[PDB]
């Protein structure tokens, strides 16, 4: 399987495979880590210019990503790998065949949940250690305690407590002592998404039937209930720019923003991500800015910006609608044909079964654009089956020729 | 002895005191013009700076509220308001034409074969 | 950000500083009663003297104006400069101004208001700081010469760019232009808060309401073709309508009726929205003119309905609410008049409601069908359930008479309902 | 005239965030 | 079943519609610019197609 | 009156205050100098010389 | 009798309402001054009705 002439380098045109992305800050630079099959890529929020890539491909597909400063924790099968700048430094191997699903890293505790409802706790060998390595203990949640684990979350100002969220309800476990300290009341609807709110002791819960719950742990009681009938929550996030805004992502591909102070809907973004590919898999507000990052299974990562209000007074009332800032994307299906655009080897033309022709950059810019299908005067075209390109006459006339499936003519394109 | 009310009125005029104006201005209201979890570990655990866990949590509690100001919603917890409720529930207000047996007046859904 | 853009922010912050002589004339020259040359010559004491007299006239017409004599039009206020007042003191200053403009909104036609507001413009520079609120109070005086004077001395906010043409222009803003400003979705949400400000305080007055009803009605008209625009008009103008209905004022409730009626014809809505519309319409229905308008509004909303359940019976809570606010005699009078609007869909829904809930009212059903001709499918539905009544409910003289009425009119179709049902 | 809506540009600013090491 | 609609062509192309349920036309269609050659209703009568050669 | 502007194009910038204090001159190290009055909010003259 | 017959009868039953067009309420501004609002809503219905 190893070549003496060739070795894998990286993947082009794939920004996200559908796994939720993880975000972090390195000094003044914010970065976004996205899973790409058996490898991951880190993009700079300022420009969506890639920074680092995995040195090697994992033996198994990565299930979940967690990013903490210079270290990103990736889980595949029963092993959790700790990566730095895309370089593998220390690998965490679980003692059970059960594969990992949900990861939470707070302080020196690394928490991994397997499909068998077993949570593995790891701790730093030294207080100044950079990453947890040592195995602290194992905590398993049984069916009587709760249902299948939805996600592992840790709230701020909690001393060694893991807010385990299950389909049935939420459970509070003290990792240091390994005891179930509190069980929340059963919820009628299945929980799908859990997001810690910027407020304290309140964690947002997304159900399968369009319900968002501001469950306050401290009171052990519901605080609020947003209703989105005929919808399923896929992601949640809060605005930390000083405005109490909550972004609700849905599997239908719609991202909704609420003014939770005003109990009103600021705006709705429709069909940002394809419903067939899972809609909005992940939508996170950037920490302390009006920028929200959204992703989906359609191989697209997108940015929105909230423009400051146009009204001198009652600025909280007149909220500018979200706007296209920048995005990276590519084919939604495997490419059918590939070719080298220029001798300098800086851009690639690529066609896939999604009826689209795309140009991908091979440099750190990661620039990507879909060649326009708008016709000159004298739905997408059928699938490209063959293509030829030359560069003797770029800028003078058409130089690309393409053949389509079940089509009796060929169309030309200009690079 | 404290000054008389008459003296205060004269003092206000001379020194240009405007505090009475601002207090009325501040009092201006437009309407008038018109233990779920108890963990033994947290009590016993002692954290070096050495302070008790509960007091440490409260200070770390108090540290967080400096980091992020608390918003007002967390404080917050026939019928006339039915319209406001339904508008909140749905962002779709077009009646689905699939049920409607009468075609739309202006928009014709037509596809070539 | 470029230094010029950042610097433009600095200039806006220090707009009213009056640091040099040249800045002072521009700020002081602005006036609503006098021209620029004379305005530069009139002094704060002179302006305050006229304003103080003006408020006394304003106090007599409405006692509420007398309060501002203690706060805004005080002799001490001559020495108050906003530039030297700290951050918390400005909002309280802003709040007191904002309420005064609400009072002046209904009295702009009166001359004393203009003199009283001159002190605010000259002393507190409301035209520079509270530019949005002053204009937003004076939208309905657009043809009045005052609004032209306001445009000349005022710098328009970004949302009011449509009025830039009429700043220092001999023609006043036309009927057509406010529609464009009111078309913009940002402003409608801006205006909404101000209407919400008046309704909580009951500041809505007819001349205000009349202007507003036309405008929302026109904005629906201006966006009639564009379907998706109408869809995003739904969250805003209805929740305005829900508020106006909540108001005890009869004028507000009817203003809600007109907007609901036109939009439903412009845009077909879900039934749950239509049924919910009733319960807010009927919940606060007390005035004599409001119920007359509400009943007409109610009938139209069914005429817009074109989906299954178009003529189904009203829910229990809705039906009970309707008969309380409109006894059966009233609708008989409603149907009696020759100029009655098309309400066959409502009556078909209403008659089916009578059968399911009220056994005593069956003899009144016979009267309704005679008064108004129901559509053939609607008659078919009324026959359908009445057959169920005979099987379940005991036979009655009124009940058999209802069939005998169907026997007399279109005998053959009564057999179809019987054939299809038993 | 149409209502002018300016894109301008957005530059992010560093913000203080709570540290989970104190939680541990 | 009985027809509830009746449309009359003309060389100018006007299509006067009559409700079959002296008669007065419900409307006088005035779009097609030429002698009307084709008048056909939908099977349910909810659509009228008017065309000229 | 407290004025803070962030710009990195020709940093660092040396700040000098007129004797009367009305007009502000800031000169960038890589060569941009702008003459402006902080109270007015009006830039007086701008030089983009790349020296 | 078939359900499609009932459908066709419902299609026959519907009767017109005049559609709201671009210039239908434009004249309303002209006669907005010093008019009772009940008569205002009457005029709105009249242009509608």
XYZ file of C-alpha atoms in Angstrom, chain B residues 21 24-25, chain C residues 44-45 47-59 64-80 93 96-97 100 112-113 115-121 123-124:
50
model
C -33.762 69.307 37.574
C -36.995 65.154 38.332
C -35.544 64.326 34.918
C -31.635 82.260 24.423
C -33.420 84.505 26.925
C -36.331 82.436 22.770
C -37.075 81.057 26.237
C -39.443 83.952 26.959
C -41.543 83.150 23.887
C -41.392 79.404 24.559
C -42.475 79.819 28.188
C -45.557 81.752 27.074
C -46.219 79.159 24.367
C -46.219 76.294 26.878
C -48.756 78.143 29.031
C -51.075 78.165 26.019
C -50.189 74.497 25.507
C -50.845 73.875 29.206
C -49.881 67.439 30.580
C -47.711 70.171 29.035
C -47.403 71.861 32.443
C -45.058 69.125 33.707
C -42.283 70.092 31.280
C -42.317 73.601 32.762
C -40.698 72.014 35.824
C -38.100 70.112 33.772
C -37.485 71.426 30.255
C -38.901 74.969 30.095
C -37.471 75.982 33.475
C -35.564 79.220 33.963
C -32.527 77.130 34.929
C -32.690 75.230 31.619
C -31.228 78.307 29.904
C -27.893 77.515 31.587
C -28.009 73.772 30.777
C -32.539 64.278 29.155
C -37.881 63.814 28.760
C -37.513 65.176 25.219
C -42.600 65.891 24.853
C -47.937 77.587 20.115
C -46.346 74.153 19.636
C -42.741 78.286 19.456
C -42.420 75.796 22.321
C -40.375 73.389 20.187
C -38.118 76.283 19.139
C -36.585 76.275 22.623
C -35.790 72.567 22.298
C -34.207 73.071 18.870
C -31.241 74.942 23.588
C -30.958 71.141 23.288
